[PDB]
Amino acid sequence: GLLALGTPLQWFESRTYNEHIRDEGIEQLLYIFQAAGKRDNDPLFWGDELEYMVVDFDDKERNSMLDVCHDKILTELNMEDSSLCEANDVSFHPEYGRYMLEATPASPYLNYVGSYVEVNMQKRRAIAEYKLSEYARQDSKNNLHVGSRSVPLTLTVFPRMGCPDFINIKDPWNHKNAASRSLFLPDEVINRHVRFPNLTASIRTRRGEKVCMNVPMYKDIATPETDDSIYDRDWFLPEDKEAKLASKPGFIYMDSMGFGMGCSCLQVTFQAPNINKARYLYDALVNFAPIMLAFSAAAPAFKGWLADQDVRWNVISGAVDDRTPKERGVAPLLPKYNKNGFGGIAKDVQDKVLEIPKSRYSSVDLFLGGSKFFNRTYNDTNVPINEKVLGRLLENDKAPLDYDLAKHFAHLYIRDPVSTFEELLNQDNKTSSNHFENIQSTNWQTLRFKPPTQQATPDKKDSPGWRVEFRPFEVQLLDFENAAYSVLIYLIVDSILTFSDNINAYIHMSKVWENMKIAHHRDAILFEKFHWKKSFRNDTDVETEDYSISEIFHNPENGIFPQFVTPILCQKGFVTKDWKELKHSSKHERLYYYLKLISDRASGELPTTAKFFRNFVLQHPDYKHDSKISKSINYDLLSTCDRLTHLDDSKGELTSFLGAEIAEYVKKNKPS
Ligand SMILES: N[C@@H](CCC(=O)O)C(=O)O
Numbered sequence: 001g002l003l004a005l006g007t008p009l010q011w012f013e014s015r016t017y018n019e020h021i022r023d024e025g026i027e028q029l030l031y032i033f034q035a036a037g038k039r040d041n042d043p044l045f046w047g048d049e050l051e052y053m054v055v056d057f058d059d060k061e062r063n064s065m066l067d068v069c070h071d072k073i074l075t076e077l078n079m080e081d082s083s084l085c086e087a088n089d090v091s092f093h094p095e096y097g098r099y100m101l102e103a104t105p106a107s108p109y110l111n112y113v114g115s116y117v118e119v120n121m122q123k124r125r126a127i128a129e130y131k132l133s134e135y136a137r138q139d140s141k142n143n144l145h146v147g148s149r150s151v152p153l154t155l156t157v158f159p160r161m162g163c164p165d166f167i168n169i170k171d172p173w174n175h176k177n178a179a180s181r182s183l184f185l186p187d188e189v190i191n192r193h194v195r196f197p198n199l200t201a202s203i204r205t206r207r208g209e210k211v212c213m214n215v216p217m218y219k220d221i222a223t224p225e226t227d228d229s230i231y232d233r234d235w236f237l238p239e240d241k242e243a244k245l246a247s248k249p250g251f252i253y254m255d256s257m258g259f260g261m262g263c264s265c266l267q268v269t270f271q272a273p274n275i276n277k278a279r280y281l282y283d284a285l286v287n288f289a290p291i292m293l294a295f296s297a298a299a300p301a302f303k304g305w306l307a308d309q310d311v312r313w314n315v316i317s318g319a320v321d322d323r324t325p326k327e328r329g330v331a332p333l334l335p336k337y338n339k340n341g342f343g344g345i346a347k348d349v350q351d352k353v354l355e356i357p358k359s360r361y362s363s364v365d366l367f368l369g370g371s372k373f374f375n376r377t378y379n380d381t382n383v384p385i386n387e388k389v390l391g392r393l394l395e396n397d398k399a400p401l402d403y404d405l406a407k408h409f410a411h412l413y414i415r416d417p418v419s420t421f422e423e424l425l426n427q428d429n430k431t432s433s434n435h436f437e438n439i440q441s442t443n444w445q446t447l448r449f450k451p452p453t454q455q456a457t458p459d460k461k462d463s464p465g466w467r468v469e470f471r472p473f474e475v476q477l478l479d480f481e482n483a484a485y486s487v488l489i490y491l492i493v494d495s496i497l498t499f500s501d502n503i504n505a506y507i508h509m510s511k512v513w514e515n516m517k518i519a520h521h522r523d524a525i526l527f528e529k530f531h532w533k534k535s536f537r538n539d540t541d542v543e544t545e546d547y548s549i550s551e552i553f554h555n556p557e558n559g560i561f562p563q564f565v566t567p568i569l570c571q572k573g574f575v576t577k578d579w580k581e582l583k584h585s586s587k588h589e590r591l592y593y594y595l596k597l598i599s600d601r602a603s604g605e606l607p608t609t610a611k612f613f614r615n616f617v618l619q620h621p622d623y624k625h626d627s628k629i630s631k632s633i634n635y636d637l638l639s640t641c642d643r644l645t646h647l648d649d650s651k652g653e654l655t656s657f658l659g660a661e662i663a664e665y666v667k668k669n670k671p672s
Pocket residue numbers: 051261263264265312316444471
């Protein structure tokens with residue numbers, strides 16, 4: 001679908017309704033509980049969500065840019081070509097990046113759908129490429145974008161984001177970019193739908209400084225000691241003076257929402273039988289998040305530099321971090337502009353300002369609890385709450401909540417609304433959840449616990465029920481990879497829901513947070529160790545030990561395969577003893593290859609996309625042993641990505657990346 005129209009309020013105009021919007025959304029939330037709290041027997045409908053970047057290959061000039069000129073694709077697919085999509089069970093939606101596409105099946109998968117996830121993904125991609133070939137035919141007749149070739153790629157990060165000639169607009173600095181005020185990103189990187197520039201601007205005003213994300217640079221023999229792309233400018237005060245103060249030697253400096261929300265991910269949403277099972281499943285998935293982030297790593301480069309990290313998470317986390325220096329317990333970089341460190345927080349509410357340990361884009365803060373294995377002591381970290389909100393969810397006449405659930409929402413409500421339309425200030429709280437969604441939707445976490453709407457009363461069997469979103473996966477290039485990882489989490493979820501009486505997955509939150517940091521290290525999948533539960537089938541107990549990703553996938557006692565994957569496959573009747581017997585199955589062979597791909601990457605036998613990309617840059621004939629990705633290296637890298645995406649092994653690249661056996665398999669067997 002397309003995003004709804006309206007007049008967004010800029011920060012100074014909107015902050016005055018902060019409390020109003022929180023209040024009314026809490027009431028909307030209570031009506032949701034009142035109406036849908038007792039749903040039961042909801043089927044396991046689920047679905048994935050992919051994001052694409054449209055890349056413009058200028059082959060004559062050996063430059064591949066982000067394509068910011070074909071964004072109409074999203075309106076046409078939702079308008080005169082919607083029937084194409086519907087007939088094909090796909091649906092397209094806007095994302096932060098003007099060059100991005102997001103797409104989902106049009107109807108949820110129901111239980112195990114085998115190769116269909118992959119089939120459906122391929123249809124999404126086929127239709128995007130179809131639209132792009134259409135434009136290429138028009139552009140030709142109108143003599144436009146000559147020499148250009150546009151391809152949607154499922155990249156996590158565009159390696160040259162914010163670097164010279166990275167977008168296909170000739171001279172984008174011939175005007176100012178007043179939304180981000182970035183040194184590197186023209187606001188053309190932002191989707192045209194007013195919501196996105198409004199959010200960019202609001203967060204930067206509220207913060208009173210630009211978002212700042214310093215990523216450790218890979219330190220090769222000739223790597224500069226500072227990010228030599230930083231420059232002085234005089235368009236914007238204070239923002240043009242922040243880089244000198246905010247950057248750090250040995251770190252890539254980024255200063256714009258686009259560097260993070262302009263990155264892509266794979267996300268998968270699951271419907272649980274009821275709220276209680278949804279709380280159980282959410283909690284059980286908490287420590288899978290950092291493990292899967294490390295596992296699926298696909299981001300080893302930012303803003304033209306090789307990084308000493310392999311995932312995007314911390315960059316997106318900083319990219320929307322609306323915390324004032326006061327909330328961050330640090331001084332403003334420029335006290336003359338950022339008055340007292342309170343950024344754009346209204347004076348008359350500065351006395352309510354809390355110190356907040358984490359960005360509103362950050363890993364789950366709290367177990368929801370409410371299940372037999374839960375104990376509140378597992379919530380052992382610093383998690384500020386909105387007491388007023390806690391009070392009201394505890395004591396109200398519509399749906400009084402248990403303390404642990406109330407605490408979850410109360411933490412979500414420490415944040416201000418950062419994107420609000422005028423037309424919406426007043427709602428019918430009985431039927432609308434827009435105010436709740438204001439806050440729900442701008443707490444971006446490794447998982448998301450998703451209430452239905454007020455309309456979703458137990459009698460309505462097809463309404464979405466209580467759902468859990470799994471949000472940490474990096475997006476991979478091939479639809480076979482993304483389907484592999486979507487089916488992985490599906491089997492894990494079905495396993496958790498099927499064996500809910502016997503699986504205790506609780507561990508201390510502090511350990512999860514620690515895992516989230518470890519998950520970023522370069523080559524973490526290959527050697528790092530992570531806190532992981534010693535056993536899952538054990539009352540009361542919450543002992544962890546430190547296990548490699550390979551042990552975490554394969555250990556008989558606590559491994560993903562022996563404790564989640566194989567047991568659900570046995571019980572569904574796909575195997576008797578072991579997932580590997582799928583190799584010889586007539587109906588389940590592709591599933592064998594999905595799981596083999598997963599097993600071989602978890603054990604280090606096959607590279608992550610991040611490792612493949614990094615090898616590529618390091619072995620490139622034009623590489624200058626200084627961590628820099630040049631237009632030339634970027635071009636060739638993305639050309640390889642294009643061939644990989646299309647299973648083109650003419651240069652042996654697919655064999656090099658998937659290994660021969662998998663490569664031969666996918667080259668010779670379509671999903672069906
Ligand atoms: N593109 C963001 C996700 C933002 C969203 O879709 O809510 C990511 O890489 O995680």
